[PDB]
Design a protein around this ligand. Structure first.
Ligand code: JJY
Length: 283
């Protein structure tokens, strides 16, 4: 079925939970043996969220190459994404090592450091120009260059230096600051505006390594971001945009990381975002 009318048909019939459970039943199951080794327990935020072995990002280190991060490679859309958990106190250096080794231009953050009174990820970037950060375990330096605070998101320019080679690179930090502590946003307008700002920066384009995107677990809000982007790109590329099937795209993405889209409300929000976004693209 088309999307917008499939949407109203699920609303009128109140069957979002049943649609979402079908997805969970059909989703791929692949091994995640490296994630479950005992030496990696303090590298995982949640015991039930792990990268599959076949798609995990490997650190270029011979001691321990493990990080909780997955490469989502979308062949028809010609887009790649790295989805990862919010960094932990003992993985902030690994996180920036990955950004460096994978040649990423942008980092997309969809959570606040504190939500619901609890810490959802480490404070992994510097907050003042004159107070830079040094990650001694991975030999990297990170400096805040500039910061632009808007009503729904903040963009930061960062300098990452490989202290071993003295090479430097500019990284863009795109921080969506207004996702509610509970539920999903009422309108997708600010999320779509944010996606378009990431796009306009070059961070999603083939001349750079994959964008790094995270929330707390790296599967829920993060899944909404890449699912909406890929669906809109396919609607631009195909002769028949109504052929784009958001449930099929989500099941393809779940071949590369488990659990993408965590609730039936996040599923409905993803439909809403693609539907509204397809009208703004034209027109
Ligand atoms: O597809 C395009 C390219 C032109 C820029 C652009 N901007 C926005 C959208 C879509 C596009 C939306 O879907 C809503 C937010 C703004």
């Amino acid at each position: 079925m088309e999307m917008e009318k499939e949407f109203e048909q699920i609303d009128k019939s109140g069957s979002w939970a049943a649609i979402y459970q079908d997805i969970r039943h059909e989703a791929s199951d692949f091994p995640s043996r490296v994630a479950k080794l005992p030496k990696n327990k303090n590298r995982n935020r949640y015991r039930d969220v792990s990268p599959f072995d076949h798609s995990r990002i490997k650190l270029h280190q011979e001691d321990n190459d493990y990080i909780n991060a997955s490469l989502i490679k979308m062949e028809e859309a010609q887009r790649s994404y790295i989805l990862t958990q919010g960094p932990l106190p003992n993985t902030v250096g690994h996180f920036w090592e990955m950004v460096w080794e994978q040649k990423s231009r942008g980092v997309v953050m969809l959570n606040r450091v504190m939500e619901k009174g609890s810490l959802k990820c480490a404070q992994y970037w510097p907050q003042k120009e004159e107070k830079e950060m040094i990650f001694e375990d991975t030999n990297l330096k990170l400096t805040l260059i500039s910061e632009d605070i808007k009503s729904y998101y903040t963009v930061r320019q960062l300098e990452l230096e490989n202290l071993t080679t003295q090479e430097t690179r500019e990284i863009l930090h795109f921080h969506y600051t207004t996702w509610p502590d509970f539920g999903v946003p009422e309108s997708p307008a600010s999320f779509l505006n944010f996606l378009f700002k990431v796009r306009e920066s070059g961070s999603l384009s083939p001349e750079h390594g994959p964008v790094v995107v995270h929330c707390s677990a790296g599967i829920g809000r993060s899944g909404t971001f890449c699912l909406a982007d890929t669906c809109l790109l396919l609607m631009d590329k195909r002769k028949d945009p109504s052929s784009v099937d958001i449930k099929k795209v989500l099941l393809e993405m779940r071949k590369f990381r488990m659990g993408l889209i965590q609730t039936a409300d996040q599923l409905r929000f993803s439909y809403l975002a693609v539907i509204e976004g397809a009208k703004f693209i034209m027109g």
